[model samples]
Target: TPEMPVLENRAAQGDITAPGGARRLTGDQTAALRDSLSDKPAKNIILLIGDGMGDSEITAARNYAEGAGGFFKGIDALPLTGQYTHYALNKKTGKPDYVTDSAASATAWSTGVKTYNGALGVDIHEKDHPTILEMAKAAGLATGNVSTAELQGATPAALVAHVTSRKCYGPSATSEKCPGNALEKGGKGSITEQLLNARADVTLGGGAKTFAETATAGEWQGKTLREQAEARGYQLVSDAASLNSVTEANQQKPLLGLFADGNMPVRWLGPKATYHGNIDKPAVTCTPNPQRNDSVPTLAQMTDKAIELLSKNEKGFFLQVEGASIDKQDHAANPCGQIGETVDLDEAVQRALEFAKKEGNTLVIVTADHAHASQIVAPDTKAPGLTQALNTKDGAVMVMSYGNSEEDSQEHTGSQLRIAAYGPHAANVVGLTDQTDLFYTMKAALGLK
Candidate 1:
């Protein structure tokens, strides 16, 4: 395995306010653009998801953390890019839902079918579809599913679990929220059960609490899912050191790393936007979240480890990595939290690129599940909505506004999202497409039937 990757520290690097301070390129690069395009078949596929990382979220993170001209080495490094439509289907009419929740958007890309807002791997009629990871695994390829959210969260679950509702994580939730999928009712059981059945070679993320819940109905009924994981040949690791000791993960003994009880903590902490807070409070910089201790592995480490373990298989692999809280913190209107997740995700993307560059036959894609509600507004303006002013890497204050929903939370927007990629089949991302089309792109890249 390669050394763990470090993110660029922009904390002490603010040198803006000069003439041409935000300039990017000095010349056209037609040669570099042409050199980046490829139509060859890929042996492996790595898909990175920045949950709810819409254009506004991306811009706000770039503006606050990287400055206007500076770029994210990982997230922005992909050469071929385009916009994609992310819309959910209505359960009643099956028409476009306009704005998509994470579950539906993830389902579209994972299964290539549009479903209702809370659906996972099911179409409007509640039919289960084979996901990219499932196809890859069935085709004799290694597969990994990783995220900052719970392994049972929408993005991760979309790839592995098929249920009518995203809320059915454990058996208890399945009983109440998704009775049709309940195991005792002659269904496929809970999301956690389906996750075990889907059986990706390496499943890593938070939500240890779900695994601690006892299985309500199944071969191992009344046993905790964690016990079931071990019984079913999974090597579980909780902290960074233990995770690092994982030498190999495979079909016989897959690795399951869970870092937190629920969703993992965000990397940075700062004041959330308040009503007219930008006007009332002083602009402040974000600080490291003490909750995210050294024991926890960063997203990049997980990515690097997943790639290393999955790549050992000559039949090729398919992996999905997600920075889940770019959506959660965005909902809370926490600028620093949102930006930090983006940066952390950027580091993971950087690691994937490092491996892709060396192997030269891996297809890496970066995109968002849905657009979020964080907006960069004028620093001096005073709007009626909630707002916060934060000092940026550009040595300036950037005002962030969010009030598109109920009082405490923000809403998802219907804007198109940026989908970027590199390696074989990368050029397929360089045009307008729907989120569902990504399944075909990854399917073709690895030649999975």
Candidate 2:
């Protein structure tokens, strides 16, 4: 019989190297790293989503993170793992749809109700529903929303606002079919107006145009959303410097940060620099321009700032951090770029895990809204002839391909996602379930059920 590897500290003998040149943890070190948390109510909840990060995307990111030889990413360290199935009914057709847009998918987890493809915090009938974050805020818990994409983008917007169409973001929701425009037909404002009127404690992301002078461009007339928010006691910050200025002392004031006019820059395409205390430096933008002077903050930085601010509340907090560009990049057939976003999300996950581990009562969840057709094909696995013919750079052997690209459609697929959890009640997040189940699980964790 083969001998089982022992787990113990080997400090005296020095670190043992694995076959791949990575250091292996000793038995005692392994045991020390294991968590022994039992089921209990969670005071703080940190939900991190890697948009469009399916099983293949996670595998690629795991390989990339490991190859970088950095410490284990927080996403990989979660103790509980499970599968989640995302399937939303089409409002018009009234049938389960295989592909779901970000809006419908986020709506499922936010409201625990299946909605149409473009719906936010609304059901298939376009009726408004209370989001878990809204419930948390009403319960006196500090609530925050952070994302690498525009703040009004589907995922973040779903947490704080309700709209029939996800496109109702910004200065003018011109379409009569959109929620804002339809509401305007009655006597109400658009989703953009509703968001500014909401009572979210902390809101951080891009989409400055939606809150600035341009917000009412072709649709309505009034003060900029920023002005309105300020009138309501929200402190606004538009750059990295101002964002970092927020501290536990000033967190009592509501925070609103818009780092870019639209979605923030992709990390891999941007200037390489650490963001611990850095200032204005050149960062790349998906749509670059000279007028855009403010540098964008990393998703991890935003998550950290959100934690600092939300932690100040006596009733704890619910923070949602998103790595949104993974899906955007995947849709554009940019495999490397998508993987980079996945890595960025993993770093943000580390921040959440740190908070959860230290605070002892926080629930840290890492998941994806839906799956993509992206896949990593390894050398010597299959398709040998094509693998040998494919071009490669120095020391590179694997290829990241989008299966949907081959079909000429990089759409979201009805695929299962892995849900990773840590801290209190982590064990309850196992087995197969619907995306809406997450909402209930979180509600139970926070004792809001």
Candidate 3:
């Protein structure tokens, strides 16, 4: 693919001139700088991802938190920060798509390779690649995958599975399109099968339906995925209370926590047509979902629990926590849900930072895989319809919406992403880097061969 516009501009600007006519670094100085950029291994690594989060979304979340009377947001205070570009090579065309889906983007980070849009831990020709998570497990380290979306979602699935299609998470596939769908003619098993057999020490999220037999159409041949997991020495927990009860005492056992039949409820939900105390406004109450029941655990709660369980191993661990609905809500053009999920993701980052600070040897990295079309726009001075007054500010506030100018589409955009890291070797993340660089950085941090 051609270079991004920003990168092209940087190249045109030529080498940066030293201020005050000073010469560039000497050879010894340059070598020392290179040495500083090299890896310093960490005992544990926690990767916190806010799906589809971008610069504007984080700023919006920060404003929201401050408006809610909070002193700070976790990511706002991170020490090392920088940007990374997201792009994946399309297998069919053998060219890079500027915009990327979660599947390919995650695959890039998981395997240090660029693949087609729907591929998991596989290359363009459907060849399997060894993922860092799998390598970490084989190297005698604990591993976990936690997300607010289905456990079989693209982000989590790429870490463990090498399926050719991202849609084949379960067995009830409808078409014979690829060689990876479970119900297709030339299939190579479903994501659920790979997930069950991959044996990550802790697996938590929704998509109970992917593991159980479909009510009308059967999926698996013999026992349910849940049954198979239990037989493989996993402690199954289905609710918030049960998840919390798995203390350090019994956390030695592998954990499989499936909280919902599918993707869990967004941070906020609404009745069919109820109004939020204003009949003229939008008719969705959008109240916060209660967490006192078997419904699901919040992203923060799940991250804390995953860290608690995974940290027990002496060989260290690798835990991934994803805030999945940020992109989902943005796709649907629901600002409330998108902002709420971003705030929720910030809380998870806080938890990871806390863990890393307490442990002193863990690396905590927070980032987004790509960008969405949504952005905050200042209204034209003469456009009265696009501006509104808020309780917090002195002047009128403009609106945030999806689209470039005239057309509005809920789709991924070819944009750079942000990363903030803390703890050991965090500085390695604070320079111009590619998405695939994360895979290598993580591998180095884990001291993997």
Candidate 4:
């Protein structure tokens, strides 16, 4: 075990020129930070990436949902948690920013470096680095990844791919074609690339729509990735129905599942999904077919499935689940949808917590990639208030709004991100940290080092 990094206050709030001036923790200090968690070394690690969530954003979701004005249900219920500072190296100014983009943040967590925006798995100096996934596999742990985005998007891709930029999505539902498959899924070799390369098992998410529908140079309009994977001796599963149909007996080797065409319908926007049926409904949108309404698998259901399959392994597993919509919601600046997505993310957290408690040796860490708009609650203003979103009983409501950024005066403002954790070594995530340290820490926890 080791002591965590210790930051000396810059003298006072505004003082920058004292001893131990705002600099990084020494290698010895950082090693201590990593070693401290050894006391509660997690056999299995589940990392939840709540991309673009800030304290205010999370708080607002709680207020909007419970109508009580506090933390969201699951998050508020957690015992140990903390916030981390965020900054990405700017290519032009050669400095960092409080507001970080997905690529830079992904790099921060993946390689422990603050690369510029649009950069993927590489470091700030533009070098490919081993990610937590690769490290975990090299250590003999089963690996899995899932997201509501294109599947090959930044957050998940960071764990397996090595590209200079995150925008280089290939023309497939899942494969990343390149030198070995440059600009491919997983890496130059990509995450999917690494899975294929290392034979690590289990992947789930939505890019299947893109891969299954890719226009293969005039041969066809789209192709089924499921067929491609099945042909390669990989067991494939799609949709909520197919996901449940998959059993441990069926997986002779690796398992792949794609659950949506895009990000699964927001928690509040769909038919009564079999998984989310228990949660109180906030908004309902009708579909063309009555027979199958609101039936998509939720983030929570995905976690349950990942645990089910990964648990089959005697050596242990590393499952990564992402709540991919907070970023989109922030961009839209829609209060209603933002609340729904955050609460949905929290529900997914609840699912992971269940698994961690069941397997006391499993470590569950929940965090965000980058902070979104500055969420601020004003007592005098006019925005509906509840603790969590939609769970409100008609009561005296307070107002909610965004705080300040260098730019926006009254809208979404970029800011530093937040990190929270629960499980063995959960206290390690507390206080300030460089976002990049997360990936390294995860690998270390799994005994990857």
Candidate 5:
């Protein structure tokens, strides 16, 4: 096998400063790609989502961290890649809304159904649907859900909770925002409660604040969610050292790690974009967030451990690992924040790909839930909306603009997303497909009913 040298690192491609000098790793890769395609049944499936990592975000991240001519070893190495539409349905008339929020988009791929914005694992008519994680568990497969965001956040929540509103993160919030889905109202409890019900073998993420809320009307009504989880035999761990020491995780003793009270701090930080800042401010480099201590595990560490624990099951596993802050930071119009998160996700992707390469029949898919507001614009141009200039790895300036909204938070766009895959059924992502199609592809690949 001719080991085609992938310029995985920026420095590896010498003299990238020259035109056409930054190229090559099998330009005619038809045979290589063809051989990589597989329709074989998968023993395990790992779905990694870079939330709000639309085309522009990926481009900016690459240009900033890896240089414009470089490629992300894991994200760019996938043999099969394609665009997927992610429009959500309107609740009132069930028409395509064109743009999608994280909740609706997550539901699309998580349950194979298009839903209204703010909905989780539910259809436009408010009907609950079984998620891929639930179905995998029911089929006797080990399941795991990990994210940088709170487990109740849309990406992770859609896999375990069915609520009419994304705001239903805990008992009090459910009572106020999603009363119809509140436990005292004769309905399923909040996202946290449903997460306990789902009880995957491994669940890791933030949102510890919600655990302090007492269950409103469940069997553990008077108990806080933390007490409830402990009483139910959940092996809870609060830091990396404890998580590393855990030897096992299963239905009998599920693993739950809550490292932060809210969404995890982003890996890097810089000033938020300001109007005309791209031209006014000097190009800056992204720096590590001082608050992100070692106690807070990186997305890659969480993913590596999740796979390590879940892979012990002979029946195989289904794991969903999310790089959540990319969306949050993009909304805040922080270019460095978003870029750092994209790098964080790619590191997790590399972990998955490494494991998948050594473990046969393990399918790994990387994608985003929806499009976001960041865009890579010419450095010379001044954007009307929020903008920032970054000093990229290529010794060049990369200006990013965020103009989707005039409000505090930027808006998601009505654009398709890139979906790439490797291992069994990797070809399924090729060509244009709807977000809902991903659910079916993974199901069929795993032979899940």
Candidate 6:
């Protein structure tokens, strides 16, 4: 048999080549690396990480959204499908905070390391580590972050913020907080401020509290860090509509946009409610809108906008987007809302698929930091259609539940999660593996080794 290749530190040999950078030939490794790419040093990478998502949640969400074509319809509907397994360290069972937290999970992909839960870029000692965003920036790639959760939350924060604990929010000049800020908000080290200071090209989603002193005051907090982004020459926007407007301004320039106060509105309240169902009606019309659960732009819409803006760059860009709330829904086990929003995430996946087709040089990946309590009841042979299987003995049905309330009560689980990849160098991680390997697979897809 051929000898297994050794994983080495060739960089000490004056070699910058990626570790797993070599191509695989068929069967085992061949089952991985789905596409035969057209070039090396691929131009773009769009990583869609759905924090705390599991295969079960993905199934439930799509069932609720597209009406029971099977969750696969939503994900498999996309041009490509890659399977993965997720596990964390130091946890009783595999799940977030069990051995993983959003911060640690995000850090896994961002810094390629697995550290303690709640820890950011630092290791167990809380020191700075290199992140994919930082690395992408070094490669001269435009970097951007988007999510439906707080900008300071682990999912988005992984791209820019680094703290000993995930809960650390706000700005920090170095160590202490100054005037016009609270610890989480005032410190220059705050997630949004870090994102702002990093000069990220585009930033969208919720978390005005992290960016401004008085988040309740208004959306942008009157020229706070968000405004500073614009003043510093970044295109800025605050609404779905303004996304295109801002991007159109300097088609070649970077962008910074924030759509809500904490997170993007979970589409559950549907098209009528504001982000996260904060408002009753559209800012334009407020008549106790019947469109209560109508049709919203969906996470997919925001993704479409982000893609259009990022792909326009000739130098290529790194976009990190998250569909939060999947975890939220799992915690609540609210079914309709949690499942609906996940379906919304599926739509986002669809949008990414479309973008990858146009930008052939791009690598698109989809994954979850961890799994929730969600589990699909085996399909009933007696059930009629998709709806029948979803219905329960009582009037209510079992569309999707984050996890049993018991699991959510303590904290996120450390259960094995899911990972997927598509586009140039798209590879597979079948059988079983821990979450950290995900970063390695993504790097392989990028030909970064």
Best model per TM-score: 5
Candidate 5 yields a Cα-based lDDT of 0.90
Per-residue lDDT of candidate 4, residues 195-246 (tens digit) = 3333447777776654543333222224443444665677767778777887
1-449: candidate 1 lDDT, tens digit per residue: 22112233222233445765444544455756666767778999999999889888888888888777677888887777899998888999979999999899999988888999999999999999999888999999999999999889999999999999999999999999999999989889899998888778999999998898898788999999899999999899999999989999999989999999998889999987888899999896999899888899999989998998999998999999999998999998888999999999989999998998878888889999888888889988788778999999879899999978766678999999899988888888987999999998889888887
**Model 1 shows how many backbone clashes?**
0
Candidate 5: list runs displaced more than 4 Å.
Answer: 1-20
lDDT against the true structure, each candidate: 0.88, 0.72, 0.72, 0.61, 0.90, 0.57
Reference-based lDDT, residue 221, model 2: 48
Scored by lDDT, model 1 comes in at 0.88
How many backbone clashes are present in model 3?
0
Q: List, residue by residue over 1-449, the lDDT tens digit for candidate 3.
A: 11101000101122334442232222243433333332457889999888889887776554443432222346665656799988988788989988899999999999999998988988888888999899899899989999989888999999988788888776664234344445344455677777876788888898888788431223435667677677767788898888889875223467889988888788754332111212223323235667535546888999998888788788999999999998887776666577679878878888887887677778888998888866655532222121221112212332454543232436887789788777667777887898999998889889988
lDDT of 5 by residue, 1-449 (tens): 33222224432354655865765453566767767766778999999999898888888998899887778887777777899999988899979999999999999998999999999988988999999999999999999999999889999999999999999999999999998999999888899999998999999999999999998787898899999999998999999899999999999999999999998889999998989998888888899999888877899999999999999999999999999999999999999999999999999999998888878678999999999988888888866799898899989898998887898799989888899888878888999999999999999999999
- Summing lDDT over every window of 10 consecutive residues in candidate 4, give the lowest-scoring window: 5-14
Estimate the TM-score for candidate 1: 0.95
Stretches of model 3 off by over 4 angstroms after superposition:
1-39, 67-72, 174-177, 180-188, 214-220, 248-252, 269-286, 290-295, 379-398, 404-409
TM-score of each: 0.95, 0.81, 0.81, 0.74, 0.96, 0.72
For residue 152, give model 5's deviation from the true position in Å: 0.9
What is the C-alpha lDDT profile of model 6 across 71-145, one tens digit per residue? 242355332344444433443333334546667777877887767777677666556777777776666666677
Q: C-alpha displacement of 335 in model 5, angstroms?
A: 0.7
Query: Rank order by TM-score, top first?
Result: 5, 1, 2, 3, 4, 6
Each model's backbone clash number: 0, 5, 0, 44, 0, 30
Q: Give every collision pair in model 3.
A: none
**Against the true structure, candidate 3 has what lDDT?**
0.72
